[PDB]
Design a protein around this ligand. Structure first.
Ligand SMILES: NS(=O)(=O)c1ccc([Se]C2CCCCC2)cc1
Ligand SMILES: NS(=O)(=O)c1ccc([Se]C2CCCCC2)cc1
Ligand SMILES: [Zn+2]
Length: 259
């Protein structure tokens, strides 16, 4: 059974023993060297189309929490940029730290942010998510950095429900949530081919990382840190530092959408 996690005894340094692709040629996350990344005029305009997004549920899965969407039709999609075709939003989740100085998976000139939001989308040409993850262009993950400053009003409904999903395996209704409230103003981005950042670490992701972070309040991120990795009635292990460090870039170039 899966026994990977984020602690010393089951964390990122151990994953390769059960998921050998951990040492592969297109692993994520990576450090984004802003000086080396090059503007790419071949990138088409990015299109985030979340007007009809239909959120359903929030789940503590023992690694993070997922806000899940109805992906039975093209209700919320990501298109354009580096992407060929249509990618359907299935869920979002975050990675975060024990302290404000760490928590992001991607880094920017080695800078770590307090957290990172991942909006996960699958390529509809493959019919279902399970099939999409087996393809090199199966998923598009829109990554957004979080820094601590002023509160993000569009985040507060997420923060407010976390008390009800404290432990692994708990879920709650989470209908009528607008994910557009989690974006920054600018859609400037970096893009590169990579992988899932958790086991099974499949090399199926086109990464699109927004340059502009969102600001959240210290009080908002503190509430993330009250979640538990453990299940109900088990010894408390705070859900903090659920991030994989940067992996070798190898034979990849990071492209910028902006001049
Ligand atoms: N290669 S891995 O999937 O990361 C992985 C790592 C460790 C273990 Se067992 C370990 C779990 C923590 C408590 C002590 C016993 C199984 C699988
Ligand atoms: N952190 S992340 O790279 O956005 C990311 C996104 C989605 C998942 Se779900 C996983 C379930 C088993 C089959 C493969 C997909 C993990 C990690
Ligand atoms: Zn993630």
């Amino acid at each position: 059974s899966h026994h990977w996690g984020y602690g010393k005894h089951n964390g990122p340094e151990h994953w390769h023993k059960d998921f050998p692709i951990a040492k592969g040629e297109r692993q994520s996350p990576v450090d984004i060297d802003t000086h080396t990344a090059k503007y790419d005029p071949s990138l088409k305009p990015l299109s985030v189309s979340y007007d009809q997004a239909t959120s359903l549920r929030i789940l503590n899965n023992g690694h993070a929490f997922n806000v899940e969407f109805d992906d039975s039709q093209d209700k919320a999609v990501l298109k354009g940029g580096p992407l060929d075709g249509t990618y359907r939003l299935i869920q979002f989740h975050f990675h975060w730290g024990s302290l404000d100085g760490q928590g992001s998976e991607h880094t920017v000139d080695k800078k770590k942010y307090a957290a990172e939001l991942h909006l996960v989308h699958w390529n509809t040409k493959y019919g279902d998510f399970g099939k999409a993850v087996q393809q090199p262009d199966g998923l598009a993950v829109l990554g957004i950095f979080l820094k601590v400053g002023s509160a993000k009003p569009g985040l507060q409904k997420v923060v407010d429900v976390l008390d009800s999903i404290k432990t692994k395996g708990k879920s709650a209704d989470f209908t009528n949530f607008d994910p557009r409230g989690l974006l920054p103003e600018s859609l400037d981005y970096w893009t590169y081919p990579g992988s899932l950042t958790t086991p099974p670490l499949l090399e199926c992701v086109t990464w699109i990382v927004l340059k502009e972070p969102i600001s959240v309040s210290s009080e908002q991120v503190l509430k993330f840190r009250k979640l538990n990795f453990n299940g109900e009635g088990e010894p408390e292990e705070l859900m903090v530092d659920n991030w994989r460090p940067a992996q070798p870039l190898k034979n990849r170039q990071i492209k910028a959408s902006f001049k």
